[PDB]
Amino acid sequence: KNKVVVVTGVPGVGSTTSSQLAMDNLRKEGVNYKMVSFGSVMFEVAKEENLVSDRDQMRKMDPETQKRIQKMAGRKIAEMAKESPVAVDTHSTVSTPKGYLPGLPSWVLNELNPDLIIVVETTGDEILMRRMSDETRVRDLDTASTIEQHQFMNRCAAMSYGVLTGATVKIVQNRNGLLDQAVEELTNVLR
Amino acid sequence: KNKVVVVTGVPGVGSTTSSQLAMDNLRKEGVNYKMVSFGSVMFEVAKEENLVSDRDQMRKMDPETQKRIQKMAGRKIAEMAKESPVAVDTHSTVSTPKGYLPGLPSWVLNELNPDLIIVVETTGDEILMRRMSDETRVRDLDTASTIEQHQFMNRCAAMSYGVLTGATVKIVQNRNGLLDQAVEELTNVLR
Amino acid sequence: NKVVVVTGVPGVGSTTSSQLAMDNLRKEGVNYKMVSFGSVMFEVAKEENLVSDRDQMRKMDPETQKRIQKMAGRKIAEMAKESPVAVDTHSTVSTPKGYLPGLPSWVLNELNPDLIIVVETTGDEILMRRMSDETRVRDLDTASTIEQHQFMNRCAAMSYGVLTGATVKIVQNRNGLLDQAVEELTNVLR
Ligand SMILES: Nc1ncnc2c1ncn2[C@@H]1O[C@H](COP(=O)(O)O)[C@@H](O)[C@H]1O
Numbered sequence: 001k002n003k004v005v006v007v008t009g010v011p012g013v014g015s016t017t018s019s020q021l022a023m024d025n026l027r028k029e030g031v032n033y034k035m036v037s038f039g040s041v042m043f044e045v046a047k048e049e050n051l052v053s054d055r056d057q058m059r060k061m062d063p064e065t066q067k068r069i070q071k072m073a074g075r076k077i078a079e080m081a082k083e084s085p086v087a088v089d090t091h092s093t094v095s096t097p098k099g100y101l102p103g104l105p106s107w108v109l110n111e112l113n114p115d116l117i118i119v120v121e122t123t124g125d126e127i128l129m130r131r132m133s134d135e136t137r138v139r140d141l142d143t144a145s146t147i148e149q150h151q152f153m154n155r156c157a158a159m160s161y162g163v164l165t166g167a168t169v170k171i172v173q174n175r176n177g178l179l180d181q182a183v184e185e186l187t188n189v190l191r
Numbered sequence: 192k193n194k195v196v197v198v199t200g201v202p203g204v205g206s207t208t209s210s211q212l213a214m215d216n217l218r219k220e221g222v223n224y225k226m227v228s229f230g231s232v233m234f235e236v237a238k239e240e241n242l243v244s245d246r247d248q249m250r251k252m253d254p255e256t257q258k259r260i261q262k263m264a265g266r267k268i269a270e271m272a273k274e275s276p277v278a279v280d281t282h283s284t285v286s287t288p289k290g291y292l293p294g295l296p297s298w299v300l301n302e303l304n305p306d307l308i309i310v311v312e313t314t315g316d317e318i319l320m321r322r323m324s325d326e327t328r329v330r331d332l333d334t335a336s337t338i339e340q341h342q343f344m345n346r347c348a349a350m351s352y353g354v355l356t357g358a359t360v361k362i363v364q365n366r367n368g369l370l371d372q373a374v375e376e377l378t379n380v381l382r
Numbered sequence: 383n384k385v386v387v388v389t390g391v392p393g394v395g396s397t398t399s400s401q402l403a404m405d406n407l408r409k410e411g412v413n414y415k416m417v418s419f420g421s422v423m424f425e426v427a428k429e430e431n432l433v434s435d436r437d438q439m440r441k442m443d444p445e446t447q448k449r450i451q452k453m454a455g456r457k458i459a460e461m462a463k464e465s466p467v468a469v470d471t472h473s474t475v476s477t478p479k480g481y482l483p484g485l486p487s488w489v490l491n492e493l494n495p496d497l498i499i500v501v502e503t504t505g506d507e508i509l510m511r512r513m514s515d516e517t518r519v520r521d522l523d524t525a526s527t528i529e530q531h532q533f534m535n536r537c538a539a540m541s542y543g544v545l546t547g548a549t550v551k552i553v554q555n556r557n558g559l560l561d562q563a564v565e566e567l568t569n570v571l572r
């Protein structure tokens with residue numbers, strides 16, 4: 001079976017860019033990853049259905065709809081994993097008006113059957129401040145505490161995925177002024 | 192077909208009080224939840240078999256007895272899950288002398304198959320303080336920290352239930368002097 | 383017969399604390415067969431000629447390790463028929479690739495545990511204990527990383543109970559307070 005890696009982090013923690021940088025590094029040494037964005041895969045389906053204009057509105061849809069578009073996005077990537085080792089960029093849980101939506105519910109977890117789950121964190125202070133200057137996307141500008149709460153539930157969910165699939169769960173800190181350290185750590189676990 | 196909701200909280204956090212007020216609010220606008228107490232559907236049995244006379248000692252009768260009066264208790268509520276909007280007042284985990292007992296183990300969970308799991312919290316100081324002025328119930332011997340620990344594990348359990356069922360997990364603070372704030376939030380998520 | 387999982391990070395003394403407690407129960411009529419899950423894995427893997435030395439236990443590929451885990455679980459479930467069993471193991475093992483579940487769902491289904499015990503203490507005391515130990519003086523862990531491991535161990539433990547219905551008991555085993563931990567363990571295992 002092809003390696004399936006799940007990378008997660010709350011919006012603004014920089015899990016996407018730091019993992020991308022790590023995978024650019026591993027490319028230069030023979031390691032290849034099919035970087036997939038779970039969010040983009042379901043965004044294309046949600047936009048195609050005229051439900052959303054931008055990716056940041058999907059978590060505002062009612063759970064029933066989010067889970068349906070989630071189920072679909074799952075099959076897409078599961079089929080995508082059949083050709084090469086996949087690095088799925090996504091979320092341990094999504095913060096919706098109805099609460100934390102598990103990003104990899106029972107059935108999706110089984111489709112993807114990941115070997116590794118990476119959780120990229122940092123402090124809520126840094127995450128708020130980063131979201132504060134980011135004009136590229138629509139963030140929820142919560143409090144450092146709310147962001148910590150989200151990271152708390154992400155750990156819980158991530159560890160559940162690990163217990164169900166046997167996947168290992170890696171927690172990596174991506175702190176301000178320390179991206180290099182984060183990239184090195186991510187590169188080693190993904191190698 | 193009917194929206195099933197699980198409302199949880201440690202004793203004294205007032206999860207029942209607050210969510211009920213929210214459901215009263217939603218009645219005046221159409222939404223009419225049927226408030227059912229798992230703690231009642233699961234008490235009619237213990238009181239019958241003379242296992243438990245007082246509701247506040249079911250979590251101590253026997254780990255191999257309360258887990259048995261739980262399974263059937265859920266099978267009965269699994270029925271109303273085929274009626275109309277149902278709100279199940281129960282516990283994420285019950286603090287028994289043998290440890291934290293999951294309130295929605297795999298079996299019971301599949302019956303209810305909830306859409307939303309609500310976790311009502313507040314600081315250990317406030318919960319401990321509320322308990323100390325309550326006599327119609329007895330469960331005081333804990334500390335602000337043991338209460339936090341229980342809430343810690345309740346978050347974990349709740350999220351695992353979410354992962355297994357696809358349900359969203361909503362955490363609501365019900366802080367002293369701010370019941371109106373909690374009620375507003377509960378009203379919005381329950382809609 | 384009760385199947386019990388005893389966990390704790392290295393250095394917390396979960397194994398020794400549990401043993402003292404099980405001895406105390408022995409002198410009371412309750413007899414627990416204490417086994418290490420890792421040892422059981424090696425035994426069954428050696429019995430079916432998958433391995434010869436415990437050194438090769440690391441070289442096992444994902445498929446064979448899963449098989450060995452099921453075999454260990456089936457074996458322990460076999461022991462359960464004869465007496466209460468205490469499986470000494472790790473909720474998660476802190477590896478370079480992250481936290482590895484000690485008891486994946488496929489093992490949980492075989493074990494059907496009734497109680498998961500989680501023994502803890504502060505990161506400071508755990509690091510202190512490890513430093514005054516001849517073997518571990520070059521692991522680079524801090525009180526914080528140990529707290530993080532204990533955090534993930536709690537989530538894994540709670541997930542174990544959610545999937546099996548077992549109760550999860552957290553027990554503090556603090557410096558100078560061993561007797562108290564032993565009494566608690568003695569009471570939860572009784
Ligand atoms: N596993 C998932 N389950 C449900 N929704 C997801 C999942 N992964 C990503 N998303 C959604 O995609 C949106 C944008 O993705 P992202 O660019 O990674 O923030 C998120 O806000 C979520 O609504």
Ligand SMILES: Nc1ncnc2c1ncn2[C@@H]1O[C@H](COP(=O)(O)O)[C@@H](O)[C@H]1O
Pocket residue numbers: 202229230231233246247248249250257261280281282285292293294295
């Ligand atoms: N889902 C559940 N699983 C096991 N016990 C429960 C559950 N829900 C309620 N109870 C029991 O009912 C007792 C009283 O219910 P409550 O009035 O809601 O605090 C608790 O102490 C528990 O023993």
